[PDB]
């Protein structure tokens, strides 16, 4: 199962469904939202209680190997929850069958829905034949059944991260704005340093990133809120010392040649000149 353009936060996951088993083998378990999923494979199935641990990377089981193989290569999550009532009946739900025995383990991300008798000699024969023995045996799923074969519903999310268009990719929390400050900025993956102000430039709606005759970025649309931000480079001046003759005295004064008396770190008195502060 592939999901698209959403968050997959664990908090909302918990309310809808509660997992008795909630563990990501290949990735972080809690941050199901952080991970940026592309062509994710959310694999839903029903297995008996002992088969729940069998279908897991690092542990190879005949039910796992010949029905839904989990080698270490994928990164994924096992999510099991108790569904005994729905998947079992006092008469017995024979809907589910397990391939208890098969010639070879499934390839990674390989499916087999075949119901054809297993050949012990390796040559398939007709089901009525004595030599061929069916691999798919019906699940023992009863309301009266004990934990040994009690039904449980397990989904394993196996995914190749960014092996396709990224689709389940949690949007991070946004430090949306800052005003009149030399800081770093990230316009939706556009990172730089400068002073930020509101922008009175009517960008064409289709284009979002600006540029200048100086070839630098005047302004660009805020992704979170489609409002434009003006960018200017941070202030840089050359400190120049004024002094009388060192013979005359030792006192000095400093000139900051292109900045107003605001941004100077700061000397008792300040005086702003057309030159600088």
């Amino acid at each position: 199962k592939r999901i698209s353009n959403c968050v997959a936060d664990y908090s909302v996951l918990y309310n809808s469904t509660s997992f008795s088993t909630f563990k990501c083998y290949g990735v972080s378990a809690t941050k199901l939202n952080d991970l940026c999923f592309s062509n994710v494979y959310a694999d839903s199935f029903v297995v008996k209680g002992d088969d729940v641990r069998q279908i897991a990377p690092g542990q190879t089981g005949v039910i796992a190997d010949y029905n839904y193989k989990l080698p270490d290569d994928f990164t994924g999550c096992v999510l099991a929850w108790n569904t005994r009532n729905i998947d079992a009946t006092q008469t017995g739900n024979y809907n589910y069958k397990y391939r208890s025995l098969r010639h070879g383990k499934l390839r990674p991300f390989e499916r087999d829905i075949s119901n054809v008798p297993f050949s012990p000699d390796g040559k398939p024969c007709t089901p009525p034949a004595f030599n061929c023995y069916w691999p798919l045996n019906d699940y023992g799923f009863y309301i009266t059944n004990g934990i040994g074969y009690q039904p449980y519903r397990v989904v394993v999310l196996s995914f190749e991260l960014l092996n396709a268009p990224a689709t389940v990719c949690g949007p991070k929390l946004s430090t949306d704005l800052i005003k009149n400050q030399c800081v770093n900025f990230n316009f939706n993956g556009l990172t730089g340093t400068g002073v930020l102000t509101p922008s009175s430039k009517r960008f064409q709606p289709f284009q979002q990133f600006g540029r200048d005759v100086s070839d630098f970025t005047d302004s660009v649309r805020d992704p979170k809120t489609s409002e434009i931000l003006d960018i200017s480079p941070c202030s840089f001046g050359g400190v120049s010392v004024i002094t009388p003759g060192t013979n005359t005295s030792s006192e000095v004064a400093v000139l900051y040649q292109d900045v107003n008396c605001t941004d100077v770190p700061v000397g008792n008195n300040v005086f702003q000149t057309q030159a600088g502060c």
Binding site: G49, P120, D121, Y133, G140, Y142, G146, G148
Partner: protein, 597 residues
Amino acid sequence: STIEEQAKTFLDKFNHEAEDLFYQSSLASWNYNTNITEENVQNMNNAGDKWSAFLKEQSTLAQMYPLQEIQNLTVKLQLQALQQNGSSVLSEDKSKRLNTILNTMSTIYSTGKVCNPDNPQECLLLEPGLNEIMANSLDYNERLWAWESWRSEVGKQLRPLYEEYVVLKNEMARANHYEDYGDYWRGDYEVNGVDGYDYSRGQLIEDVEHTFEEIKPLYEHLHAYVRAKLMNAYPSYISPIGCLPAHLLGDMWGRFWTNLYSLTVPFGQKPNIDVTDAMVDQAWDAQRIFKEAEKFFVSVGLPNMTQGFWENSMLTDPGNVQKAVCHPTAWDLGKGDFRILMCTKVTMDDFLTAHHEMGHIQYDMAYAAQPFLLRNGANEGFHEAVGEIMSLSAATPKHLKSIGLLSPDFQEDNETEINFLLKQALTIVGTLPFTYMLEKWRWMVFKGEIPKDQWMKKWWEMKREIVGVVEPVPHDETYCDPASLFHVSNDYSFIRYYTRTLYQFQFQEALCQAAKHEGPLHKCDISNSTEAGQKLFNMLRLGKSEPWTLALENVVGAKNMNVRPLLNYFEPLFTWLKDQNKNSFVGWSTDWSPYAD
């Protein structure tokens, strides 16, 4: 690909299909057991017959696999189990004839009843009614009449059926290349081809005789003491040097001797060991008894019980329209479904029976990981022995003091100690000669050491000789008293109880070895220490994958059947018996009889 690979393939398909099939069979059985109704029994013979026919039809395929090709022992025993045809390999007429005669036995013996001689309206069956009076009544005539009538009304109806039964069962045994049905029983412990962990069939008789030779003096002293106490309770009825009447032993056939305690109490002026009154005092129900049993299981190291047991099983007597049998039975069903049937009252005997069946189901849960037809005891006696271990350990005062009854200031004088030893010894000892005589008598009936018109004379003569019990009235060839017993007419061997009894004290000593036991074997409790837990668990799960010999040498470190643990358990009580009976005669005379004088 190879022979063993395809054998494993077939056996694993057999596991994965027989799981559901026998689970359906046991579901129908359980529906019959929790609800006795014609629809339930009609469900019972559908899946049960489907299971028997499944075994036969897949044996027709397993027999195609040769047996003498697998070097391994794990799957070779599975092939042996599937290749055993069971009871369906005979001539077409005679196999079904023996089956329907056995079914007729199971019907008539179980539903039979006896009627008042002067009133053909007062008619009652065996259980209850007859066993309760012959366990507590002081009337000679009442007990004698019940004892005679139960063997008269249905024993006659079972005698010709038993006459056909011995012949047809021996023919079935011969068709399966056995000596007799006694050899079939001796073939239950039949492991082969191990060269050191092996066990023959006649060696069963050898061991039983050799380990009962040590019981004979202890049982002789106990028989002398119980004859003296029967003098005390039933004066002017028995010879001081003779044997015992068959209706004064608490039960129908003299099997269980616990009921004699009210009339064989050594020192009645001392506090009682029976805690049924204490259990009534706290107004306990079945649920509290079973939960306390499970807590004691946790204390020794065995796990809690699953949701299915407390969600499915029947624990109290219904009484209402949904009437059902109430015999204590553990039920292995697979699929994590391990159940128990007991209609439990507030009784100390019921407490120990609850522990007994809890131990059986704990054993079943431990070996649940075994293959489906190896999901059973390594032999027949180990299941019962493990079940009785918990009853024996729980019966000690060291466990009652921790239960909550019997306020924890309990004295440790020799008076109540000897009382408890004798109370346990009645059952433990007096069940052994009866087991010996019944098993040997049936073995030689099936073998042919008794002419078919000599069954009863020899049966009662060895009740006199081995058990020291005399029939109060003469019996002709018309009756059949052994067939008037549950295990003879319902296809159950009896030596499994002897193995239970001996392995019971063997496992007692084994579980006290690691439990830092300080006193003699009688005060030993396996509670609160988990080392006995894994020491019994390295038994509790092997199943029929390994023989009982390897398992027994891992448990107690012994190779052969031994009763010396029982002798050392009862040795202080043996000295007490020798001291007490100095004014009486130790032994019994087979010539005396209530009808011979």
